[PDB]
């Protein structure tokens, strides 16, 4: 019955292609006329952090929005105080090759996973002096891409095994596994209400899951390469995807179409990181040509350029209250902007 | 400029000084990436598994070998991490000729890469005596069918070594190809020699010479 099942799959793909076409009354580019432009933006480097002796791969702010984390290839994990610019904790890592790291919202825990297919939780604020490893969770088959603390006993983890799963830190066992994708999963992003999350992989597609249920609802396909970065809109009814063909896209959830594309004829290289502003009127994007652009989020034109690092921009983060932006790179220095 | 804020600053300078001592200590090591096909006598050569990392010492110098097996993902995605490595060690088995074309294209893939422009290679051909036993009856025209040479061993191996040099199209990249005999051959000496030239070659670029 393979020929019968193959057409039953086709006829439904033809229906969904005609559903999305009959909804679009007009484009956004028509409605976004008759508004005042943002006008040229400019920021200087406020502070510089030094200590790492290898490429910076990941970093993360805290809810306090004064302390931040970072990880490098030398096998160290440093916690900085951004105001006085002094080190609080420097942890010696077990295996040298780390790719991602997180920071809990309570500010009591830290995670990091690499090419060992293992995620390690570190307990800050021990009764004795030193920091130690609370728990170790190894259930994956491939390397870890991303991980995010849902709560102090719940964490979400994606891998190069073409799957992602939800963990319980106290018992140290998998709760539920999500299976839809056909390529290596690169990034994921939590919703504001910690109910929904979306991921993006190397089959040039992105899916939207339901944490409590364990099923995919929608699939958005608009790229021509491997999706690297992804980020939710502050309102929580849209997101933006960064790809390896020098283009960013803007999708909606209530309306199923793609609403905008961002591209310049000069740039010809892939995006590493994306992030929104607090109001969500600016959209920052890290490229691998030693340059970070600042796009308008409605007009879809460049509003400014942040001064280059010596090597590729790997990770950038906007803080909660929205005062500063922080960026890392392969020349092993962090810089904070304003 | 406070009671506690001064003590907090004193702690930071103690941490700052501590990790730079480890930075100097970790610069006296030789890092080697051990690639190649599976069942190619990789284990003898060294003398959900994520990564196997080994270490030995020979003539007062510390070596570190990183073997990547049982990963089965997209290489390019995670070959960024191994961008600077003193050298690469590739292994091939002459025992069976139907894994030669797969191993040859695989070598051609790693050889000409964006990140490995100037990184030199060491090429170990194994099961030397086993290859030379079965050259008697089974002709060499089964693989690399266009030409072989003489029927017997001595001038056959020359033809394979020639194919791997033909695959190199890089302007300034060396290939130190040696031959291993069965499972009883000293290889530590062979590597120690190959590592020396690579350090000498790097220092010449640093000097006014060349």
């Amino acid at each position, epitope marked *: 019955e393979l020929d019968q099942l193959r057409q039953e799959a086709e006829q439904l793909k033809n229906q969904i292609r005609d559903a999305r076409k009959a909804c679009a009354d007009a484009t956004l580019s028509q409605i976004t006329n008759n508004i005042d432009p943002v006008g040229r933006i400019q920021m200087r480097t406020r502070r510089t952090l030094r200590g790492h002796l290898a490429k910076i791969y990941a970093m993360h702010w805290g809810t306090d929005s004064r302390l931040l984390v970072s990880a490098s290839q030398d096998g160290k994990l440093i916690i900085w105080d951004s105001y006085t610019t002094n080190k*609080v904790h420097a942890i010696p890592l077990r295996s040298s090759w780390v790719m991602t790291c997180a920071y809990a919202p309570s500010g009591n825990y830290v995670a990091c996973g690499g090419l060992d297919n293992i995620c390690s939780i570190y307990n800050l604020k021990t009764r*004795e002096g*030193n920091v130690r490893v609370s728990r170790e969770l190894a259930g994956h088959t491939g390397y870890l891409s991303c991980c995010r603390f849902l709560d102090d006993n719940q964490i979400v983890t994606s891998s190069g095994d073409t799957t992602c799963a939800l963990w319980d830190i106290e018992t140290g066992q998998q709760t539920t596994t999500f299976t839809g994708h056909t390529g290596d999963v690169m990034s994921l992003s939590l919703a504001p209400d910690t109910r929904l999350f979306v991921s993006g992989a190397c089959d040039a597609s992105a899916k939207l899951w339901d944490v409590r249920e364990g099923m995919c609802r929608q699939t958005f396909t608009g790229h021509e390469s491997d999706i690297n970065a992804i980020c939710f809109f502050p309102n929580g009814n849209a997101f933006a995807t960064g790809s390896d063909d020098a283009t960013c896209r803007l999708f909606d959830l209530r309306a199923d179409q793609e609403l905008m594309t961002y591209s310049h004829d000069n740039i010809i290289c892939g995006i590493t990181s994306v992030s929104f502003s607090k109001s969500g009127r600016l959209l920052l994007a890290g490229y691998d040509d030693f340059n970070c652009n600042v796009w308008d989020a409605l007009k879809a034109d460049r509003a400014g350029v942040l001064a280059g690092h010596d090597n590729r921009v790997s990770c950038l983060g906007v803080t909660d209250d929205g005062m500063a932006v922080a960026t890392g790179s392969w020349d092993s220095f962090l810089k904070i902007w304003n | 400029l*406070s009671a506690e804020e001064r*003590a907090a600053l004193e702690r930071s300078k103690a941490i700052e000084k501590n990790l730079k001592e480890d930075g100097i200590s970790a610069a006296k090591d030789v890092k080697l990436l051990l690639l190649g096909a599976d069942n190619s006598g990789k284990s003898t050569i060294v003398k959900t598994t994520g990564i196997v990392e080994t270490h030995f010492t020979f003539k007062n110098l510390h070596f570190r070998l990183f073997d990547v097996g049982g990963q089965r993902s997209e290489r390019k995605k995670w070959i960024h991490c191994f961008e600077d490595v003193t050298a690469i060690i590739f292994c091939v088995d002459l025992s069976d000729y139907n894994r030669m074309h797969e191993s040859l294209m695989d070598f051609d893939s790693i050889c000409n890469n964006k990140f490995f422009i100037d990184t030199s290679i060491i090429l170990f051909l194994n099961k030397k005596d086993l290859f030379g036993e079965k050259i008697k009856k089974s002709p060499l025209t089964i693989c690399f069918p266009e030409y072989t040479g003489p029927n017997t061993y001595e001038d056959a191996a020359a033809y394979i070594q020639a194919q791997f040099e033909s695959k190199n199209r890089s302007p300034n990249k060396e290939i130190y190809c040696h031959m291993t005999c069965a499972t009883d051959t000293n290889n530590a000496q062979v590597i120690f020699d190959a590592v020396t030239d690579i350090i000498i070659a790097n220092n010449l670029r640093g000097c006014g010479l060349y």
Partner: single-chain antibody
Amino acid sequence: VQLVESGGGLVQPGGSRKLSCSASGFAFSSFGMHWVRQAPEKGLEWVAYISSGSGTIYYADTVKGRFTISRDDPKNTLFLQMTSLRSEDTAMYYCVRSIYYYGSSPFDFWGQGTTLTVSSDIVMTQATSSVPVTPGESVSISCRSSKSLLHSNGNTYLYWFLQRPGQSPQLLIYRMSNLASGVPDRFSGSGSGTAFTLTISRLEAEDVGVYYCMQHLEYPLTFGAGTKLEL
């Protein structure tokens, strides 16, 4: 965690003796260390301090040049060497640990203390001696300062300690507002400038002791006179 100290009995006036404090159950290398005295019918008072890595040393005004302090990291032991003892050093001696980085609690854990006998700045006032109390009632303790303990940064340096009858004193509140780990949710702290208040809600049995008031703005650390809660 366990800090135990020993050495010292009765001496001859103008002699010498050593005090040894031996630690176990934590990383001794990382923490700083203090010495604190308590006369037989009086409040607490500070003596000496050594930082982690032996980088900085400070003494009191009273005992400067007479006493000396030193630590041994390999064996985890703290030494206090005292020479030419006068006839007003007759007191218990406590052995206190502390740590300093952004968002931590100094003076969290105290020792047990040894009895030594000899045979023959910021001023802070607590206008109370004994306060009448009854169980199931709310009370207020008031510590008044000399000059304002608020810095350029928002944080105010004021600590509250409690001593039960025949035991070692423990930390209740650090940096005025914040509350110490393991302490119940009955105690609360408030104050602005030079006047401060400790408020207790629904006091119950095994909660009566001498309450002390300490500042950490400048060296040397001055303590209060102390407030007593009756039976």
